[PDB]
């Protein structure tokens, strides 16, 4: 979508596997604020926004 009409997807009820996302090489920018990407596996979150 466009900038002024940015989409927002609700994420819930997941066995979330972030290892496949980390190991992919199609992303030029991979930056995280306050969370180590390698530590995303053990943590549990109440809700995720995309």
């Amino acid at each position: 979508a466009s900038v002024y009409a940015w989409n927002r997807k609700r994420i819930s009820n997941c066995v979330a596997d972030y290892s496949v996302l980390y190991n992919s090489a199609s992303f030029s920018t991979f930056k995280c604020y306050g969370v180590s990407p390698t530590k995303l596996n053990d943590l549990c979150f109440t809700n995720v926004y995309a």
Partner: protein, 49 residues
């Protein structure tokens, strides 16, 4: 009301200890006030910050 001179010593000590305990719930600028979340959430190189 006669034993106030003896009661205030206990009150002062109990208040100092309570304030000391209450000081553990402060961020002081960090992202969290509890050390386990910080250790379980951040990578080793930048946790010391």
């Amino acid at each position: 009301s006669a034993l106030g001179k003896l009661q205030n010593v206990v009150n002062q000590n109990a208040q100092a200890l309570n304030t000391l305990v209450k000081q553990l719930s402060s961020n002081f600028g960090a992202i969290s006030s509890v050390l386990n979340d910080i250790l379980s959430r951040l990578d080793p190189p930048e946790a010391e910050v």
